[PDB]
Design a protein around this ligand. Sequence first.
Ligand SMILES: [K+]
Ligand SMILES: [Mg+2]
Ligand SMILES: [Mg+2]
Ligand SMILES: [Mg+2]
Ligand SMILES: [Mg+2]
Lengths: 48, 74, 354, 52, 92, 31, 143, 49, 95
Amino acid sequence: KFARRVVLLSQEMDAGLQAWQLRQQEKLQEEEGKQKNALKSKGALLQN
Amino acid sequence: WHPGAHVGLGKNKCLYALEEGVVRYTKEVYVPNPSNSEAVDLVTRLPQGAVLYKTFVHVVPAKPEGTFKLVAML
Amino acid sequence: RRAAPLGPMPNEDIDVSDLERLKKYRSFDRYRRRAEQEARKPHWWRTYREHFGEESGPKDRVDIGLPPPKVSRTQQLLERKQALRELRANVEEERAARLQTARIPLEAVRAEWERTCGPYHKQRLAEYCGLYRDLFHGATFVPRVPLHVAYAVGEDDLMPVYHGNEVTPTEAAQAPEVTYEADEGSLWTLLLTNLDGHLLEPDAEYVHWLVTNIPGNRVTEGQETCPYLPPFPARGSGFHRFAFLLFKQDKRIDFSGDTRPSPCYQLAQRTFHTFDFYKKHQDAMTPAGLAFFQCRWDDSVTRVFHQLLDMREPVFEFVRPPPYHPKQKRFPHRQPLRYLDRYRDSHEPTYGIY
Amino acid sequence: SKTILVKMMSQAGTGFSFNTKRSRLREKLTLLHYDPVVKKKVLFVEQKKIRS
Amino acid sequence: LASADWIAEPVRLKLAVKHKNRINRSGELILTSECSRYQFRNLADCLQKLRDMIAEASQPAKEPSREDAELRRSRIENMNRERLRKKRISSA
Amino acid sequence: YRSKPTHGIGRYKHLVKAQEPKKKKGKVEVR
Amino acid sequence: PVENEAVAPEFTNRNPRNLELLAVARKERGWGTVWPSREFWHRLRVIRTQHHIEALVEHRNGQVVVSASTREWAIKKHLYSTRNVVACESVGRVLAERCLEAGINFMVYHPTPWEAASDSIKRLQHAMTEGGVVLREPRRIYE
Amino acid sequence: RLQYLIDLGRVDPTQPIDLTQLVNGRGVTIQPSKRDYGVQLVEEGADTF
Amino acid sequence: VTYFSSRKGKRKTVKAVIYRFLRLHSGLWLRRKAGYKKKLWKKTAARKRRLREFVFCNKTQSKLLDKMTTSFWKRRNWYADDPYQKYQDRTNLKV
RNA sequence: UCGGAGUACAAAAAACCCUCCGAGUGAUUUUAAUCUAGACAAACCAGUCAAAAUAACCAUAACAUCACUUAUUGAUCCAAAAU
Ligand SMILES: [K+]
Ligand SMILES: [Mg+2]
Ligand SMILES: [Mg+2]
Ligand SMILES: [Mg+2]
Ligand SMILES: [Mg+2]
């Protein structure tokens, strides 16, 4: 019973760490999506 | 605590929420009512670089005012 | 356990000692001006602007529009002052001004307001009504060119359409006329859309008019793509916003993929996405003008659903959330007799075995 | 100085009486109350002395 | 409504003028009730409501008016839109 | 509150003078 | 059946002014210990600097919708001085026209008590009343 | 309940029905001592009668 | 409370309770606020309204009054034109 | 018996034949309505606030004020008065 608890506790910590890394990549990939989704700013650049 | 947005004020200076939502506490500036002689006198004597700050209690509404539903299609 | 403040305290700049040397306010209208200027600063503590929807605070607005006209400030500064000196020296003006008896040519101010600061004032009107949010999302444009939309109602009466006005559908039954100053060296595109009013999809907008490749001022001579359709707001949900968009295009563009049939009455074919539409032809077109009005329900809407759209008229209603009540206790304590009425299901008495 | 409690009857004919505390040295009091029976403001006059 | 011959011709058209919001596309006047749980009372309410509709429309002299809180702003927003309408220039 | 970093944000009595009220018995031009 | 008859049971209106124009939107009731009261949809803000007169119409979010001030070159070249009683009238008349053009017909003005008796502010509201813009916003329905 | 009694033969509509027939049908029980003055007809089942 | 009477041997009731309480068939008891007729000129408008309202009794008071009265007053009564007739039975009580 | 400050230093509560102030009402008119969501407080009895709605009156008008404003007060039964 003790050994199974060690395996369960070791996997949950490892699985929880993987989830955080996925969110960090997901947050960055979402940021670059907004940059590559808007419109080409004409603004004052038309006369520039 | 002075009342803020969506918060009433009873005759015994108790604060009660007017809308359903989340209670929030905030530090804001104090601009007294001109008809209050004692408060406006305190503001008058302040130096130019100072502003009164007081604490306020707010209630940010959660439920919307209402929604439109199809009642009849003639 | 005292903690250290995260930044400068508000009133720590002034010296507590030597109070008499510091000049006072002496007024109540000075404090209000000072307090309001202090209330708009980004303080490090929790503020009202933080919790009550400041719309993400500072936003990097994307500008997609014609560049502002090149004006020389040095020449403008001298001519503006020179013109004022001529008006200042007039004695008869002083006679009227002192005696509080003078008026101004509001029509003349209207013409000059449009040319000088009209585009900037119209920009915040669209932002306030969220036209940019529902059309270009974060992107915004300055309505540089003036635009005039008017409806022919009577024999000679002319209902105008300004920014954020209100027009009854009866006035808008017929197609309007658009007048704007432009030379015969470029092309323009006119687009009228119903931002809210789509039935199945809430994020889509209908199209009521679309004229393509307009040669200069004459709108009629331009190629027609989508025919005019009178506004048809629902009876329940009122005040739909209809926006006129003017696009300036460099080259003759092939606006054939968006062509609609002539007696187009299928609302599924009127589905439109301005951001998607502007995405395809972003290189050629450029927004230049804007004019939008509010529109509620009237009797003339009914015939549109029946005769024109061949549709049963849908009627909505504003429904409020049901009242909130606490969980019912078996033995209410010091509660009025009406405590039972709150949780009653129906007022019709219901007998059981009897 | 002692005050007097007097009952005031409506002058609108309806039977409506509310008590009011009054100073003893003052003369007969006459007020402008609001009786719900007529749902309108009507004159009220002092009628009887009840409590001192 | 058109073929309902138990009402007079002036009464029939006055119902369409006032109650045009309840008229279906096919000319079918629709009246609905939700008050009581028993359908006998619901039908009785509809009949009494229909009698009142006919009774007030039947009388030519019956033309009551009223003032409401929404009527004030409706008049103001109507008056304000007439300010811009006053210009009279050649149209399209 | 004491422990919060925003403690003492409402302090004002050190901005204005004490302004001793003219007491009925202590009314005197103490110069 | 008819493909054109499909209607969603719930209709979503994205117009921010739809609730405001229907007099069903929430007014920010409360405060009371401060001034001015922030229970409004639109507020008229009149600022009288020693050189110019500025009038603002603000939403409760802090944004300014329509503004008419003597600092504009359009109004400056038609007025003799920007700090007269007549200058306030011109600001009032110009703002009244713009508010009608912007569709704003109701607003709340809370003047300082001494400004309420001032000659310029008294006649400024007269221009607004005759300009078509009506103070005293309508009461909220089911407040 | 009046419809329920008739369907099960507790009372019959061929013969006139009064308070006595209801008691013999065990439909209602009347206690004269407890100031009971009879039976009142309610409209709980008017739709399916 | 006389648990066993000396004449019939049954359980008596306390007449003080019935003269000033009303028992609904759901077990809830009804009573008037104390002091609703004393010194009305002294009390405010809100206070007088609160004292004129009927109120319920909590579990201990309700349980106490059930042991002081006999079983005749707990019966089901069908009065003619009874204002409280619709309050007799509880409804939509999720305990 | 009732209120305020300290003891009880920062949510609430917290004692002594503990240390100090008070209350058992006046002045004035703005004479202060009816009805109901939701809560604070509390052994019980009591005490407090209160949106919406209706009426009153600027014709889309509810906090009586001031005196440290906080305390200025008494349950049934019973008696008297118009009810
Ligand atoms: K929509
Ligand atoms: Mg029985
Ligand atoms: Mg509690
Ligand atoms: Mg109210
Ligand atoms: Mg006794």
